[PDB]
Design a protein around this ligand. Structure first.
Ligand code: U1Q
Length: 330
């Protein structure tokens, strides 16, 4: 079995990507945020507090002939940005681009935090990290990828995110036409439940490459690139007028400046992120200060290779017995 689906940016800044998912019988299509930094499949539903729903498409388990309430099961999640959601759990049929999983745990949101209610284009999340992170109590549940793995031609999924344009999420196969050159594979550590790997270094613009180990996670659910203070300072020192702002909460730069590119190492291979991908536009409408896409991970505790880095490459998440990450230039 294989599955193929288009992922579309939610706004002109590429803040998040939505992918249509079919849930239940007859199918109810919801636009979900595919997140490799979490492991819960949760949706806005007929059970979510009415005041916390503003334009999202909801899942209605009562209208699904295949929906089963998982008796006594509850879930509760908290993300790195201080956002959260919780509720009860159902089992139902879930399909992504023609790939079907029966008996998938679908977490029905009863309470969602403000950042979710405010984001009317996102109907929920589809976690693609390892299942040890799933928050279903008292019986932990498997992710969509874990449930589909037996049926897949190859136990892999690929992320090919577009820059201001649509992209693709493929399951069960590698599209040899979606990248150039060869794929460089790197080791994954699953100890924290994430797709965790080690970058071999970096370069700023046309500068010399610095060989230094950078441990971080491949996260499609995070918009920006979060790197150690030293690395981030070295990058913004090359942008005239750039400074770190406590009021804004990170590095800002004059909107009229040209941003240098950022290179990260994958083994002996290099991935170049064009400077244009690092521009996140004005901090406020009309402002001449622009927000940077490369920020410090000092307050996070973990380095995150978010959408800013991933959209610059073809990314293979090899979920074989010993997991690996593949990167290729596109
Ligand atoms: N990995 C993440 C980070 C934030 C969020 F809202 C969802 N997923």
């Amino acid at each position: 079995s294989t599955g193929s689906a288009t992922t579309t940016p939610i706004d002109s800044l590429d803040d998040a990507y939505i992918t249509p998912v079919q849930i239940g019988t007859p199918a109810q299509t919801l636009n979900l945020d595919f997140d490799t930094g979490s492991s819960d499949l949760w949706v806005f539903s007929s059970e979510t507090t009415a005041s916390e729903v503003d334009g999202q498409t909801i899942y209605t388990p009562s209208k699904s002939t295949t929906a089963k309430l998982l008796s006594g099961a509850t879930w509760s999640i908290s993300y790195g940005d201080g956002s959260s959601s919780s509720g009860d759990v159902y089992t139902d049929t879930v399909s992504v681009g023609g790939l079907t999983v029966t008996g998938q745990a679908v977490e029905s949101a009863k309470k969602v935090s403000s950042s979710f209610t405010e984001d009317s284009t996102i109907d929920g999340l589809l976690g693609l990290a390892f299942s040890t992170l799933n928050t279903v109590s008292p019986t932990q549940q498997k992710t969509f990828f874990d449930n589909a793995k037996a049926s897949l031609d190859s136990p892999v999924f690929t992320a090919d995110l577009g820059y201001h344009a649509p992209g693709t999420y493929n399951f069960g196969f590698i599209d040899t036409t979606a990248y150039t050159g060869s794929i460089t594979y790197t080791a994954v550590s699953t100890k924290q439940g994430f797709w965790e790997w080690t970058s071999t270094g970096y370069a700023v613009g046309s500068g010399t490459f610095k060989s230094t180990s950078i441990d971080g996670i491949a996260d499609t659910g995070t918009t920006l690139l979060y790197l150690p203070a030293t690395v981030v300072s070295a990058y913004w020192a090359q942008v005239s007028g750039a400074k770190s702002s406590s009021s804004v909460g990170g590095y800002v730069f004059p909107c009229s400046a040209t941003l240098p590119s950022f290179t990260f190492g994958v083994g002996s291979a290099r991935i170049v992120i064009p400077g244009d991908y690092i521009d996140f536009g004005p901090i406020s409408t009309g402002s001449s200060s622009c927000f940077g896409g490369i920020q410090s991970s000092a307050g996070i505790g973990i380095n995150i290779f978010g959408d800013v880095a991933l959209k610059a490459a073809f990314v293979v998440f090899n979920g074989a017995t010993t997991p690996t990450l593949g990167f290729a230039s596109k």
